[PDB]
Ligand binder design. Structure first.
Ligand SMILES: [Zn+2]
Lengths: 86, 130, 608
DNA sequence: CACACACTCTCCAATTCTCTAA
DNA sequence: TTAGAGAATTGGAGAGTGTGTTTTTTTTTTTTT
């Protein structure tokens, strides 16, 4: 059966942050004075990444869960690794 | 993003269809700028629909007519978006109870009731009857 | 019983290697040449003939006939596996399902029944003699049978789902559901692994654009009445028709259907209640329905008008006047009907004209006005209460729509039917309520009426309405009112009796020493002569006026101003234009007007 | 009869509470 | 001050139980024939 979870080890560092590193390589922001549409583009890309990661939840529920997951060993180790090299 | 859309299993681009219908509205003139007169009539009368002749669509652009006949469920909402975009690009502060409906029609019947087939499903047809 | 894996290869060998000679002894592979067309989508229906299969394996023919549906599926699988061998061109996509399949194939490069756009049918072997419906017994269940019958009810062509195509909203994948049963369960939630493992909750939307439909048509066949046993009701069978077999047959058509006799599948509570019993249908596989130079040189004879009139009723003497009038009934006036009424005693050769004209007319009916227990002059509703659907039947006036309707005992017509005759003669249609909702039927037909006096023999002492007891509102619609008299007359009676006795003892018409035109030649002639649409010249208006007024004034001066009106002139013009059509000249002339006037005058002379 | 709906109960495991070490 | 290992509580998957279903004719009577 394998009921999935948005936890620290199934997908957040497997289809999650490693892909999120690449999501915005081809983004198209235009800077000062256009913060509204830049934020709309950002929110759409983040929402799409979150949906493909864990499709069971809505976007704000996903955010409220992943913010809790930010305290876990695997998540912060991957965060520091992504900060450093790869 | 609208430019990424294609009708399902169809290879027709929704944005290109919208642009083709917009230039049709802008440039067709000869039933003897035709449809901007109809837009002005809508603007003053207050009826949210536009009647359009499929023969005019065909003579202006055969491919657009083929797309309309084959895939009306997507193409006709695309035409609704096109006509509303033109109408509210003009007449900027006119108020309508609803968005305009494009109502394509053939002047005469394309088919009859006895010859309707499963090949015609989800296809735009014109028939005469009582 | 047999190994169907080996049987499929046998079928492939037959389809690949069979050959027949069509022209100049040249050899052709009749099924390979059709597999090429099937591969190119030039042809959709493949009728494989078990008479051809019998030429190299009668055992395969016996297996097919005894287990037909299994072998139909095997032949379809074999043909689908063979078409790639015969591919040599690209298809022009013309169905939207072709376009969808094209993009499906491209995305797969980047559902066998779905990719299968053809249909295969067994054309029955001649060793299987055709049965009647009553002989299609339970032993023939699941077996290929040929059945003859009358088509009596045909549904509209409906879309029958074969392969339902769905799309998922979450994962963007297509799902396919082949449908064998008459009913099926729609798919709700996506069964794809991507949705299932993630518990995505993505659901399925049917795409009719991507799904495969087939034309479907139900009909009812009925036994031939002369083939029913003596005391019995005619039996009936449902035939389910699909694909290219649809629209072949219509109601009233005599048909022979080769098909598979199967029991009906049931769902819900019907299988609970019915138990071992089952209703049956025939799965249709093949439906079969049961001058210019040479005769123009004959038509050049000046006899041709009287030759046709003589050919309109060779069994009757002296009535060539009436036969000419009935010729103009069949020809009709310029646009246009011509209506005729015949009055006479019961038991006279006045029904003979109705019978002959009905037989000769291409579209026709011959009913009686005496209140039929069936479908009357007008339409009627049938309930079909195995299912309950109301359906509409035409009747005499509707079934004779673009032709001629013969009505015997026209006087005994009830008022409910007389009003319908008024509707037909005024506006050429009838109207009926099917379920409280009213539908309108065409009846653009010429009426040949035959009445009898209300009581006793005809009596010229009385007026015509007194004789027939039918109002002038009916009688004035007609163009010619004829009295078909009958008096004892020794030599004519002797000849009639000799004629009828010859007919009895030899079952054939006696030699009359005249050669009438054959019925098919007469039909081709009338079509050729009614194809014309003449016009009356304006210079003849004065002569038409003169003829009309002098006929009118003779009625004033000599017969107490008996009824005439402007429709008399209109009837004269219609008769003269019918004569012009008959003569195949596109201009009406003095002779046409004279003969129309003469015809009307002699009909009134027969009355008087 | 029997094949779909409608409803309840139980178990399983996933999340949160409590106490401890980094 | 953060967070992680062990114990207890709550969410919901799914196993099990019970319910519901597939125009026609003869005769009378009042009013109108
Ligand atoms: Zn899916």
């Amino acid at each position: 059966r394998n009921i999935p979870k948005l936890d620290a080890q199934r997908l957040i560092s497997e289809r999650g942050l490693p892909a999120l590193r690449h999501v915005f390589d081809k983004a198209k922001f235009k800077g000062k004075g256009h913060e509204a549409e830049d934020l709309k583009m950002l929110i759409r890309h983040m929402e799409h990444w979150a949906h493909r990661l864990f499709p069971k939840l809505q976007f704000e529920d996903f955010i409220d869960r992943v913010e809790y997951l930010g305290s876990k060993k695997e998540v912060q180790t991957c965060l520091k690794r992504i900060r450093l090299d790869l | 993003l609208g430019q990424k859309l294609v009708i399902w299993g169809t290879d027709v681009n929704v944005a290109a269809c919208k642009e083709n219908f917009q230039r049709f509205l802008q440039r067709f003139i000869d039933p003897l700028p035709l449809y901007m007169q109809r837009l002005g009539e809508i603007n003053v009368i207050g009826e949210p629909f536009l009647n359009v002749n499929c023969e005019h669509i065909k003579s202006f652009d055969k491919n657009l007519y083929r797309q309309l006949i084959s895939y009306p469920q997507e193409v006709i909402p695309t035409f609704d978006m096109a006509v509303n975009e033109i109408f509210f690009d003009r007449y900027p502060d006119s108020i309508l109870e609803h968005q305009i409906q494009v109502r394509p029609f053939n002047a005469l019947k394309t088919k009859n009731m006895r010859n309707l087939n499963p090949e015609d499903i989800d296809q735009l047809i014109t028939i005469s009857g009582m | 019983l047999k190994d169907y894996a080996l049987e499929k290869e046998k079928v492939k060998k037959f389809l690949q290697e069979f050959y027949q000679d069509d022209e100049l002894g040249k050899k052709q592979f009749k099924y390979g040449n059709q597999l090429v067309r099937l591969a190119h989508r030039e042809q959709v229906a493949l009728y494989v003939d078990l008479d051809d299969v019998a030429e190299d394996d009668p055992e395969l023919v016996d297996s097919i006939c005894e287990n037909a549906r299994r072998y139909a599926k095997l032949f379809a699988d074999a043909v689908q596996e063979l078409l790639p061998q015969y591919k040599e061109r690209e298809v022009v996509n013309k169905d939207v399902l072709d376009v969808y399949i094209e993009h499906r194939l491209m995305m797969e490069q980047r559902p066998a029944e779905l990719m299968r756009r053809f249909e295969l049918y067994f054309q029955g072997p001649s060793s299987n003699k055709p049965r009647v419906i009553r002989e299609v017994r339970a032993d023939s269940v699941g077996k290929l049978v040929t059945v003859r019958g009358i088509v009596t009810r045909v549904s509209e062509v409906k879309p029958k789902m074969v392969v339902a195509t769905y799309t998922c909203d979450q994962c963007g994948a297509e799902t396919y559901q082949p449908i064998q049963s008459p009913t099926f369960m729609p798919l709700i939630m996506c069964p794809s692994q991507e949705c299932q493992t993630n518990r995505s909750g993505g659901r399925l939307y049917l795409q009719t654009r991507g799904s495969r439909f087939i034309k479907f048509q139900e009909m009812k066949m009925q036994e031939h009445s002369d083939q029913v046993p003596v005391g019995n009701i005619p039996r009936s069978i449902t035939v389910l028709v699909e694909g290219e077999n649809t629209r072949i047959a219509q109601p009233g058509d005599h048909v022979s259907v080769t098909g598979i006799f199967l029991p009906i599948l049931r769902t819900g509570f019907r299988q609970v209640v019915q138990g071992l019993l089952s209703e049956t249908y025939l799965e249709a596989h093949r439906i079969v329905k049961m001058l210019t130079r040479e005769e123009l040189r004959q038509i050049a004879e000046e006899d041709f008008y009287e030759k046709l009139a003589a050919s309109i009723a060779p069994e009757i003497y002296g009535h060539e006047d009436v036969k000419k009038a009935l010729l103009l009934l069949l020809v009709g006036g310029v646009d246009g009907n011509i209506n005729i009424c015949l009055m006479g005693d019961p038991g006279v050769a006045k029904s003979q004209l109705l019978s002959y004209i009905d037989r000769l007319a291409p579209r026709s009916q011959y009913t009686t006005g005496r209140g039929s227990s069936g479908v009357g002059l007008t339409a009627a509703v049938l309930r079909d209460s195995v299912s309950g659907e109301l359906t509409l039947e035409g009747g005499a006036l509707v079934l004779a729509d673009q032709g001629v309707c013969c009505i015997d005992e026209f006087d005994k017509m009830a008022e409910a039917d007389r009003t319908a005759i008024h509707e037909v003669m005024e506006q050429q249609t009838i109207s009926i309520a099917k379920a409280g909702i009213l539908t309108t039927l065409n009846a653009r037909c010429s009426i040949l009426a035959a009445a009898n006096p209300a009581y006793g023999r005809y009596n010229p002492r009385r007026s015509l309405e007194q004789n027939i007891q039918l109002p002038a509102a009916l009688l004035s619609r007609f163009d010619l009112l004829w009295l078909i008299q009958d008096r004892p007359d020794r030599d004519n009676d002797l000849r009639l009796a000799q004629h009828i006795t010859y007919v009895h003892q030899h079952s054939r018409q006696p030699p009359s020493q005249f050669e009438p035109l054959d019925m098919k030649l007469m039909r081709r002639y009338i079509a050729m002569c009614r194809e014309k649409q003449p016009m009356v010249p304006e210079s003849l208006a004065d002569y038409i006026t003169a003829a009309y007024v002098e006929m009118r004034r003779e009625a004033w001066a000599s017969k107490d101003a008996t009824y005439t009106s402007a429709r008399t002139l209109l009837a004269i013009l219609r008769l003269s234009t019918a004569l012009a059509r008959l003569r195949m000249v596109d201009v009406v002339e003095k002779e046409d007007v004279n003969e129309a006037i003469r015809l009307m005058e002699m009909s009134k002379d027969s009355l008087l």
